[PDB]
Design a protein around this ligand. Sequence first.
Ligand SMILES: [Ca+2]
Ligand SMILES: [Ca+2]
Ligand SMILES: [Ca+2]
Ligand SMILES: [Ca+2]
Ligand SMILES: [Ca+2]
Ligand SMILES: [Ca+2]
Lengths: 38, 42, 38, 42
Amino acid sequence: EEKYYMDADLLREIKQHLKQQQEGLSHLMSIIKDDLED
Amino acid sequence: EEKYYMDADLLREIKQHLKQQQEGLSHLMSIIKDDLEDIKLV
Amino acid sequence: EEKYYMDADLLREIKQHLKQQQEGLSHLMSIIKDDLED
Amino acid sequence: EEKYYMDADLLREIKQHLKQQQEGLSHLMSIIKDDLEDIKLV
Ligand SMILES: [Ca+2]
Ligand SMILES: [Ca+2]
Ligand SMILES: [Ca+2]
Ligand SMILES: [Ca+2]
Ligand SMILES: [Ca+2]
Ligand SMILES: [Ca+2]
């Protein structure tokens, strides 16, 4: 079972990056979605 | 059929997103690399 | 009305980046979502 | 309550995503900057 030790700090930073990226994309969609469609 | 105008607000928000992505990727990749690399040749 | 000229190539690259980033995040969610929840 | 193990597959896919993000941001930011900057001092 291949697995990787990490501290809570590193896992938190990974989680935060994914969350913030999604939030950013959703923010952009709120501007550009209606242009992609018309 | 080949050229577009983009509104200022949309361009501003895109540039801000890309800048923030970049700052985030750079930090995250550096800390992942340094934490997982536990033995390094001097 | 402040606006910015660009060619189809540049707009396509912007669109592709946003689409590919979303796809990547959705891909990661298909692995990590059940860990975030339990 | 302070340390974790991450499975190999999840780590692999995260690293791949970050690498791909980075390659994409670098390219996109460079072409945006160069296209919008239309006058440059020699
Ligand atoms: Ca719009
Ligand atoms: Ca407009
Ligand atoms: Ca370490
Ligand atoms: Ca999982
Ligand atoms: Ca496991
Ligand atoms: Ca130009």
